[PDB]
Amino acid sequence: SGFRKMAFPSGKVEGCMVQVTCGTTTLNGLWLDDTVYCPRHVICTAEDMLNPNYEDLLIRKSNHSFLVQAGNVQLRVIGHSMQNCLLRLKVDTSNPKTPKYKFVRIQPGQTFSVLACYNGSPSGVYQCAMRPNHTIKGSFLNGSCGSVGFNIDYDCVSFCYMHHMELPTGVHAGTDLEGKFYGPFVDRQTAQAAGTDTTITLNVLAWLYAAVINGDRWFLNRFTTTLNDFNLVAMKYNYEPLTQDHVDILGPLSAQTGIAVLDMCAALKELLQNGMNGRTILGSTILEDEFTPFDVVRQCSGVTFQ
Amino acid sequence: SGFRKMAFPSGKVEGCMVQVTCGTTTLNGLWLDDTVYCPRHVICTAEDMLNPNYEDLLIRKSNHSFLVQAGNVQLRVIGHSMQNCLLRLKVDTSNPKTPKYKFVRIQPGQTFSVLACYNGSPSGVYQCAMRPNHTIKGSFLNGSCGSVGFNIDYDCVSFCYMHHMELPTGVHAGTDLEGKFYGPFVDRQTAQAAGTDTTITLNVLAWLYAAVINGDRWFLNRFTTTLNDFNLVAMKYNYEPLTQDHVDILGPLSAQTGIAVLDMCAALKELLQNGMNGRTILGSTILEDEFTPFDVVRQCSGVTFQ
Ligand SMILES: CC(C)(C)c1ccc(N(C(=O)c2c[nH]cn2)[C@@H](C(=O)NC2CCCCC2)c2cccnc2)cc1
Ligand SMILES: CC(C)(C)c1ccc(N(C(=O)c2c[nH]cn2)[C@@H](C(=O)NC2CCCCC2)c2cccnc2)cc1
């Protein structure tokens, strides 16, 4: 029993974190085989963060412009190239702790674990959802850039996020491991701001199923809804529309609990319209949208507490 | 910016987790140097969980009654002994991944990271507070016993919790690494239940300081309070009394923010009496008591956003 925001064990990623320095700027890099990946803004001059031209800044660097430190050991840079908003530094040593890994681009609403790091040293781990507006609600201080997000499946690490910058509301923006930003953000100092966000309906429904699996039914009702009638309510409450594809994704949780998806949607409609009347669901006084259907299946028992 | 429940990186603990089997029961153990620690209830018969006598059950076991598996490798047990509610199994191999470590008994209100494990395989990591009633709000399924809780300071792992059992309300009970239970619980099937809990006042105050450090002051007021007048309100709202010792602990956070402790207590008094008026603090619609003063200092900037 219980239900918590649960990160993946971080050891396989810890063994990949290094420190990258260029000029006076230090940040974190990810060392896999003989390549170190880091944000290209490591080369940005303090004097000009407003209008960097990265091609022009990078051509002025040599391999020995970059210092890479793995713990106490210096790794010699023997090549470098820019890929989108990342630098790929080739080093003289293959990381002996490289795990089985893949690079994947996650979709909005999906979750991943973040290993917050400073100066190449891991500091903390927590779970994040990629918001519909392409930001994450992380916890990051100066120098956290280059920290990574990942999921783990059967000892294969799927890296999906590298941290680049903080936005004015205190939320965080970054790229995939090909260097392509999530969202419309850019790696320079501009007035950019996170767009309007929305609640991840599929995740709320998954978490209501988690509550039933764990033994609680107080919020169910005798009603059903059509998809279109639910979506009229969702629009009013800034929830994402439910689609037939999302209904299909909820199939296994619906089967484990015996609650049809559209019946759970009717329960959610009533909770939105009437509130929770001072009660909790899975310990929470609000509806939670930070757990995917996969996260619920990963964490909950496969046997409902009937 | 940001503020999240943040666990310590788990890799140093992952390298210590093994599987222990006795008879038909399997659970997790902790392998440090040439010793494996695990819950003594691994020897309990399925037929008699109501009234086990562990001395009488253990004398009937030999070293080869115990199977220990580290990944795919079998570790031969060459000795065994009971210490309180733990077994200490001596094995033929010293763990080459043993970190610098200590065993410590934590106090109520303190936090630690939990590495949830099944069959000796780490599954997830999350942060827990030891509640005043000596339980934790974990997330644990059958076979999680022997999972450990820990804090990390300068690469030294302080182990403080080993998981033993789940209580009727779905919360979790366990021991320190000397095998002494937290709380009045016992390792057998009884009617035992968690006692009444209370809110950890010192942690709420620390988290209000975190909110100011991160730039938010909306909940402050022009009033102050005496310790005794605050404690009259605390009793009404099931908050722990504030003590002078706890006031002293808040010294550094008070200095970083310029808010006297008793002035923050007046703010908390008003929040308890009037509620939060539909507003949030650090993203939360409720007052949070799961972060210690140390956790706030660990995670927040050392410079207040004034
Ligand atoms: C060059 C560029 C792209 C403008 C930049 C500058 C600084 C950083 N930040 C580094 O901390 C940092 C930079 N290099 C080493 N560390 C921080 C950051 O985003 N401030 C923002 C201030 C407003 C305008 C854009 C940047 C940061 C803080 C907390 C968590 N995350 C990141 C990130 C990007
Ligand atoms: C022998 C004894 C002390 C009564 C016992 C029995 C079972 C377990 N539980 C094992 O899962 C388990 C046991 N051995 C291997 N796995 C689970 C558990 O506590 N059920 C309780 C049922 C009510 C009465 C006491 C035990 C468990 C589940 C979820 C998370 N945590 C633990 C723990 C202790």
Side-chain angles (χ1 to χ4, degrees):
Chain A
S1 199
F3 197 80
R4 299 292 313 274
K5 289 193 187 170
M6 192 167 327
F8 284 105
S10 61
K12 289 179 175 68
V13 178
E14 294 168 48
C16 301
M17 299 312 304
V18 299
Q19 183 186 258
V20 182
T21 301
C22 184
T24 57
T25 300
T26 299
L27 46 60
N28 304 285
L30 181 70
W31 180 27
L32 301 165
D33 301 318
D34 67 340
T35 304
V36 172
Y37 302 82
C38 71
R40 73 181 173 167
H41 71 69
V42 73
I43 72 181
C44 186
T45 76
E47 292 71 38
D48 188 16
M49 309 170 293
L50 236 57
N51 190 32
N53 185 291
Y54 285 100
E55 187 184 343
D56 193 81
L57 291 164
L58 185 60
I59 209 168
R60 300 170 190 265
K61 305 302 190 190
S62 69
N63 287 332
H64 57 277
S65 299
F66 300 93
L67 300 186
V68 179
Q69 181 169 330
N72 65 327
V73 175
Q74 295 302 134
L75 302 181
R76 190 166 84 86
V77 175
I78 59 174
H80 64 272
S81 66
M82 181 164 57
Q83 181 184 22
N84 300 308
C85 301
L86 296 183
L87 296 184
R88 298 186 290 190
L89 309 175
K90 185 169 170 168
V91 292
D92 64 352
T93 304
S94 184
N95 183 358
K97 297 176 190 173
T98 304
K100 182 175 164 58
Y101 75 93
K102 299 190 286 72
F103 291 166
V104 312
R105 187 171 176 90
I106 59 158
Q107 300 302 316
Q110 299 198 275
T111 55
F112 55 93
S113 302
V114 169
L115 182 64
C117 295
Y118 299 88
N119 308 290
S121 290
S123 180
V125 74
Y126 49 87
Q127 195 74 347
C128 281
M130 175 63 66
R131 304 303 313 173
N133 74 358
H134 311 287
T135 66
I136 62 178
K137 296 179 160 64
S139 180
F140 281 134
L141 302 181
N142 292 338
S144 57
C145 306
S147 293
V148 299
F150 59 97
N151 286 287
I152 306 188
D153 197 57
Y154 310 106
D155 296 276
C156 176
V157 179
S158 288
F159 293 102
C160 60
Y161 177 86
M162 180 160 282
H163 181 54
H164 290 239
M165 66 201 319
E166 190 169 74
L167 296 167
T169 54
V171 301
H172 300 112
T175 67
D176 64 26
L177 269 294
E178 297 201 308
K180 298 189 263 277
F181 262 92
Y182 292 106
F185 310 111
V186 296
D187 53 349
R188 58 180 180 278
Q189 176 183 329
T190 80
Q192 60 198 324
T196 313
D197 207 21
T198 189
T199 294
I200 309 157
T201 302
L202 174 58
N203 290 3
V204 179
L205 291 167
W207 171 86
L208 292 178
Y209 279 109
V212 177
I213 290 170
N214 283 18
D216 198 1
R217 295 175 58 101
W218 71 258
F219 49 84
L220 300 182
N221 67 34
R222 69 169 173 101
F223 301 112
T224 195
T225 185
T226 67
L227 202 54
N228 211 65
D229 291 339
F230 174 88
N231 283 342
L232 298 178
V233 176
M235 271 203 69
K236 172 172 180 179
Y237 290 93
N238 194 24
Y239 267 55
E240 295 185 318
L242 195 60
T243 61
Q244 185 61 46
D245 289 356
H246 294 173
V247 172
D248 293 342
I249 286 169
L250 290 168
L253 289 168
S254 177
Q256 189 177 317
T257 59
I259 297 164
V261 174
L262 290 177
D263 292 346
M264 191 66 84
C265 286
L268 174 56
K269 182 196 297 180
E270 180 173 306
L271 287 169
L272 289 177
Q273 294 171 332
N274 296 344
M276 300 171 41
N277 289 119
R279 303 183 71 162
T280 55
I281 298 174
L282 290 171
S284 180
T285 62
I286 59 163
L287 302 171
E288 293 244 64
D289 79 344
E290 296 154 313
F291 301 94
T292 64
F294 177 97
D295 295 342
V296 169
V297 170
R298 169 187 167 211
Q299 185 174 164
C300 286
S301 179
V303 175
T304 294
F305 182 18
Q306 293 186 242
Chain B
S1 199
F3 197 80
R4 299 292 313 274
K5 289 193 187 170
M6 192 167 327
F8 284 105
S10 61
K12 289 179 175 68
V13 178
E14 294 168 48
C16 301
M17 299 312 304
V18 299
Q19 183 186 258
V20 182
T21 301
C22 184
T24 57
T25 300
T26 299
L27 46 60
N28 304 285
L30 181 70
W31 180 27
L32 301 165
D33 301 318
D34 67 340
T35 304
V36 172
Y37 302 82
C38 71
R40 73 181 173 167
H41 71 69
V42 73
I43 72 181
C44 186
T45 76
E47 292 71 38
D48 188 16
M49 309 170 293
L50 236 57
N51 190 32
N53 185 291
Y54 285 100
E55 187 184 343
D56 193 81
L57 291 164
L58 185 60
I59 209 168
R60 300 170 190 265
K61 305 302 190 190
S62 69
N63 287 332
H64 57 277
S65 299
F66 300 93
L67 300 186
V68 179
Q69 181 169 330
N72 65 327
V73 175
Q74 295 302 134
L75 302 181
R76 190 166 84 86
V77 175
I78 59 174
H80 64 272
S81 66
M82 181 164 57
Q83 181 184 22
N84 300 308
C85 301
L86 296 183
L87 296 184
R88 298 186 290 190
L89 309 175
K90 185 169 170 168
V91 292
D92 64 352
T93 304
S94 184
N95 183 358
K97 297 176 190 173
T98 304
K100 182 175 164 58
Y101 75 93
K102 299 190 286 72
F103 291 166
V104 312
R105 187 171 176 90
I106 59 158
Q107 300 302 316
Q110 299 198 275
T111 55
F112 55 93
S113 302
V114 169
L115 182 64
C117 295
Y118 299 88
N119 308 290
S121 290
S123 180
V125 74
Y126 49 87
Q127 195 74 347
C128 281
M130 175 63 66
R131 304 303 313 173
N133 74 358
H134 311 287
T135 66
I136 62 178
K137 296 179 160 64
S139 180
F140 281 134
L141 302 181
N142 292 338
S144 57
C145 306
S147 293
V148 299
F150 59 97
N151 286 287
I152 306 188
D153 197 57
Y154 310 106
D155 296 276
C156 176
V157 179
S158 288
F159 293 102
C160 60
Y161 177 86
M162 180 160 282
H163 181 54
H164 290 239
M165 66 201 319
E166 190 169 74
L167 296 167
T169 54
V171 301
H172 300 112
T175 67
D176 64 26
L177 269 294
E178 297 201 308
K180 298 189 263 277
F181 262 92
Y182 292 106
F185 310 111
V186 296
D187 53 349
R188 58 180 180 278
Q189 176 183 329
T190 80
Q192 60 198 324
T196 313
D197 207 21
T198 189
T199 294
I200 309 157
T201 302
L202 174 58
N203 290 3
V204 179
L205 291 167
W207 171 86
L208 292 178
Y209 279 109
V212 177
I213 290 170
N214 283 18
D216 198 1
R217 295 175 58 101
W218 71 258
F219 49 84
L220 300 182
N221 67 34
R222 69 169 173 101
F223 301 112
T224 195
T225 185
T226 67
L227 202 54
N228 211 65
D229 291 339
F230 174 88
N231 283 342
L232 298 178
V233 176
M235 271 203 69
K236 172 172 180 179
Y237 290 93
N238 194 24
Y239 267 55
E240 295 185 318
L242 195 60
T243 61
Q244 185 61 46
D245 289 356
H246 294 173
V247 172
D248 293 342
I249 286 169
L250 290 168
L253 289 168
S254 177
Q256 189 177 317
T257 59
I259 297 164
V261 174
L262 290 177
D263 292 346
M264 191 66 84
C265 286
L268 174 56
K269 182 196 297 180
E270 180 173 306
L271 287 169
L272 289 177
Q273 294 171 332
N274 296 344
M276 300 171 41
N277 289 119
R279 303 183 71 162
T280 55
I281 298 174
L282 290 171
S284 180
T285 62
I286 59 163
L287 302 171
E288 293 244 64
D289 79 344
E290 296 154 313
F291 301 94
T292 64
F294 177 97
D295 295 342
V296 169
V297 170
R298 169 187 167 211
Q299 185 174 164
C300 286
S301 179
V303 175
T304 294
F305 182 18
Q306 293 186 242

